[PDB]
Structure formats: C-alpha cells, structure tokens
Paper text:
DExD/H-box RNA helicases, from virus and bacteria to eukaryotes, play important roles in processes including ribosome biogenesis, RNA processing and folding, ribonucleoprotein (RNP) remodeling, RNA nuclear export, the regulation of RNA translation and transcription, and nonsense-mediated RNA decay. DExD/H-box proteins often contain accessory regulatory domains and localization modules, but their cores consist of two RecA-like domains joined by a short flexible linker. The N-terminal domain is commonly referred to as conserved domain-1, or DEAD-domain, and the C-terminal domain as conserved domain-2, or helicase domain. Both domains contribute to the binding site for RNA substrates and both contribute to ATP hydrolysis. We used X-ray crystallography to determine the structures of the DEAD-domains of DDX2A, DDX2B, DDX5, DDX10, DDX18, DDX20, DDX47, DDX52, and DDX53, as well as the helicase domains of DDX25 and DDX41.
The two helicase domains have a sequence identity of 23% and their structures superimpose with an r.m.s.d. of 3 Å. The helicase domain contributes to nucleotide coordination via motifs V and VI. A superposition of DDX19 with the DDX25 and DDX41 helicase domains shows that in the latter two structures part of motif VI is not visible in the electron density, indicating its flexibility. The conserved motifs IV and VI superpose well, whereas motif V shows different conformations in all three structures.
Author numbering: 406 to 525, 529 to 568
Amino acid sequence: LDVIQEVEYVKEEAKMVYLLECLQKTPPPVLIFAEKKADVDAIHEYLLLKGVEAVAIHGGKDQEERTKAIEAFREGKKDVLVATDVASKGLDFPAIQHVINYDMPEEIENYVHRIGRTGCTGIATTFINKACDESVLMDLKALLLEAKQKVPPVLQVLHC
C-alpha cells in the first residue's frame, strides 16, 4: 500500500537492456521477480555478464545453491536476488529498496504480494506489454489510481 509503483511498457525483446538501467533507481538490495525458471536463469546470467552482484533462486536450484543465495542476499553480500514467486515465498528478506517485476502476473492479487515485498518506502517497477489481458491491466490501473500513483500512457487510454 505504501510503495512508489512505476509501471512501464517494455517490449519483451527490450526488457533485458532496460532492466540494467532500472537497477540504478535505487541502492541495493534489489529483488527481481519473474514467473518462469528459464527467465530467472536468463536475467541472472545477463546481470552477471554485465557485472552485477547477482544471485538467483528457483525450484530447479539444488539445496546448496538456494541456501547460499538466500543468505548472501540476506547478509548484503549480494546486491540483486532474482527469484520466482514460488521460490521466494516465506523467505526472510531484508529491507528491499526496489522490487523489479520483469513479468506482470496474471492475477492482480499476485502483483500486490510482489510489490508487498518493499515498504514499511521503496520502489516497485513492473514491465507490462501486449501479452497482458485487459482485466489485469484494468486492475493495475485501478490500483495505481487508488494508490495515487503515476499511470503510464498505455493505461491512460484504457477508459477515457
């Protein structure tokens, strides 16, 4: 409820580059969420290739890896944790300065929970595009407005 939500239209083929730029709105720590394992893996490899202290958690990591990352992050030894929703559930995270939603969830319920991982202020960035159904976009729109947040142009048309 008390986070600055920054929702932005980003073509699928442009997110990786934009993500790098995003990391800079904020000092660490940063949590990047994506629905799929493949994605979490891509983003982590990209961040590494660009030189970001980045760790990743998902259902396909073994116990060694999960533990090592959940805790380097939790100590501040790593700036960025990239996670799936399901892998991050119940983890004890520190004060997160910035949530980056690389995906828009299908349910608005889930958008909230993700952005609910920063606050108590902080920034939530959410990449939206063509693939989102109208319904979630309306609920995102409805939410930004109730939250008294910037509505990006692409949503400002939804209902004029």
